[PDB]
Amino acid sequence: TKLHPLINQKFQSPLSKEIFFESYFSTENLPFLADFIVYEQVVVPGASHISLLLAAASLTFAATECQIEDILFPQALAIPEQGVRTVQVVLTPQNNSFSFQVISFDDSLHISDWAVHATGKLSVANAEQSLIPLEEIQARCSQKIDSAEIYQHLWDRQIHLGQSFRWIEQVWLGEGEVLCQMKVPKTILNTTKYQLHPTLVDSCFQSIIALVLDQSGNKNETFVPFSIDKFTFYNSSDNDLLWCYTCGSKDKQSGEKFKADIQLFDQHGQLVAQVIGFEGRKANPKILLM
Amino acid sequence: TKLHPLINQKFQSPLSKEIFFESYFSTENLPFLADFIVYEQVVVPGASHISLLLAAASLTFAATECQIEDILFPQALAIPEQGVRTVQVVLTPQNNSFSFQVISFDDSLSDWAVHATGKLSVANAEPLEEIQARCSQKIDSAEIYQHLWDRQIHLGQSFRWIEQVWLGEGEVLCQMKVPKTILNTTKYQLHPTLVDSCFQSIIALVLDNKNETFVPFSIDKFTFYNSSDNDLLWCYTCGSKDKQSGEKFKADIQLFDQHGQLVAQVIGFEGRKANPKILLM
Ligand SMILES: CC[C@@H](O)C/C=C(\C)C(=O)O
Incomplete structure (x- = not known):
């Protein structure tokens, strides 16, 4: 029961304006994460959060083409050795789009310590192919x-x-x-x-x-x-x-x-x-x- | 992966003040529901919502004894034949308590129903x-x-x-x-x-x-x-x-x-x- 290899569960409620996606980031769940080593630490690059938002999109929109705009990466995500960080995508409805925050926190201790790893806007797009040359x-x-x-x-x-x-x-x-x-x-x-x-x-x-x-420098x-x-x-x-x-x-x-x-x-x-x-x-x- | 026979998943987030519990009500998932038959319809009584809230309590408090106060049953929960209703408990923190709403809605498609409301807090033990x-x-x-x-x-x-x-x-x-x-x-x-x-x-x-x-x-x-x-x-x-x-x-x-x-x-x-x-x- 995995909605998407990058997304364990999705949650929404008539009593919540946001839509949530929840995922458990670790080398055991995501083996390729062990291949991005920065100063000897397992680090999740921003590109990964982009792939994660494409997943969420695929679980919320009906169409396949979509666009992520005004992306920022406030804080890098690092995973301690044999550690697992809970990662959530939080979608706030806007006009024909969602503002998103990708955050994480340590589940093994409510919550109080957490980090923001990506922010921006998310909406459907149209085809434009292509081509190329x-x-x-x-x-x-x-x-x-x-x-x-x-x-x-x-x-x-x-x-x-x-x-x-x-x-x-x-x-x-x-x-x-x-x-x-x-x-x-x-x-x-x-x-x-x-x-x-x-x-x-x-x-x-x-x-x-x-x-x-x-370049020099x-x-x-x-x-x-x-x-x-x-x-x-x-x-x-x-x-x-x-x-x-x-x-x-x-x-x-x-x-x-x-x-x-x-x-x-x-x-x-x-x-x-x-x-x-x-x-x-x-x-x-x-x-x-x- | 079932947290409690009445609760499939729990959700909370630093970006959400409420705590959510999610449960899938149907005769196959909860067999005894087939034993409360009203005029050819399966109905979930309030007492059932009480047991659901006790489950949530056991998944949220550190203590074992707890109490539910100012309970109302705004709307009965009915499950069509071979139907499945998503049921959620929504807990909003108050002063040393939670206001709760027990709601449900049909997953196979904004339209939803409230089946219980009230307050929830710890209690103490007491021929x-x-x-x-x-x-x-x-x-x-x-x-x-x-x-x-x-x-x-x-x-x-x-x-x-x-x-x-x-x-x-x-x-x-x-x-x-x-x-x-x-x-x-x-x-x-x-x-x-x-x-x-x-x-x-x-x-x-x-x-x-x-x-x-x-x-x-x-x-x-x-x-x-x-x-x-x-x-x-x-x-x-x-x-x-x-x-x-x-x-x-x-x-x-x-x-x-x-x-x-x-x-x-x-x-x-x-x-x-x-x-x-x-x-x-
Ligand atoms: C070219 C570096 C690119 O792959 C991403 C590097 C990141 C996110 C980092 O070092 O934290």
Whole structure:
């Protein structure tokens, strides 16, 4: 009795204006969580909360396309060794949308200590596919580079990505743009029940690292996902191969903000997901972790 | 994964002041519900909602004894054949208490019904032969079940807890044993059918229009102290019709062990005559 691999139960009541989704986050319930290690701690990235909201959406809307807007990640979620954190999605009805807060707390002790991990707005969307163009893009992005450079760039910042977070198999650089080929890790097997697997969303955010491999600065810091203007999920892909096109640059005013648009699409070019106004900010992941 | 035979799930959140308990009422999930048949409809009596609140208490308080105050039964709960009603207990914190609403609604589709309201808080803990002397009129338990049978309130086998009855002056002492159909009474605080039987005790004082009987309407305070592992318990009941209007019956009840340990007590029980036809819609 699992509503969604990411959601254990849903609760609503005529005597409550909010709708609740409840989930138990731990390495045993979600094995791939053991593959995102920051300074030796299990950490749930924001991308994961995006996948979680797509799940909730799939349990509340009748349609498949939806959009998450004005996303912020106030506080990172870390899971102590062999620990389990209760995570809730709280949806407040607005005009033809829901304001959402993704929060968590330690169930094993009412409640008083809790944390907010994501906030924003959530509503249905329409199809916009697509399309795309995949061959026009392979022409602008022709400097092949090794995917290891991305993972190594993260490894040096103490962001140790396991197998299930390493979707990017190939990388082509252009002028301020990058095209990644992605394959489903061999350690992931249930992508059919997910709208977008947390690790796939994260890989999409990882693509931006390929535009900042050169930069000088503090080797302790990297660009961490900080805000998103709009994330649109169109439909889930049975495909083991996807393409991810990203473009963006550092803010002219502040060399600590990296702004980008991202497009995840099909082998045939059907747009799977789209990100407008992705902003990452330079940070030491240690300080995010508390 | 069932928290309590009457409660499937519990929910609370730092972003919700209320505590919620959720339960799925249907004949398959709760077999004994098939033993309370009103004019071809399955009906959940108030006593049942009381047992549900005792369950919630056992899942929320640290203490074991608790009390329900200013109880009302705004609307009876009816379950269509092969139907399933979602039933929720909603607890709002007050000053050292909870205001509660017991509600239900049909999951297979804003439309909902309130079946009980009141207040809920902790309580404290507090002679059989002296009683067996004042109550010496042996009478057949069938008289109560027959008296009810005539009002079209048909209690099945699992609702027949009263094995023996001794009547006194405005008082009754009932011997009760667990029907052969019940085997799981250990996980309940107070099994719904036993709570209902206690309310059934008052009928032995009203064996006197045969279409109507006293329907539970309000309770001043219901106190649950502790459950008895005993398959045999004692039921002490006293009360009378309101002196001013012969339509209200007010009574206190004492359920206790063969050893004399008080298991549960009801103060200010008030029932009102009503036609069960009108309850069902
Ligand atoms: C490129 C880093 C991206 O995958 C997300 C990192 C997060 C959320 C963190 O370090 O807390």
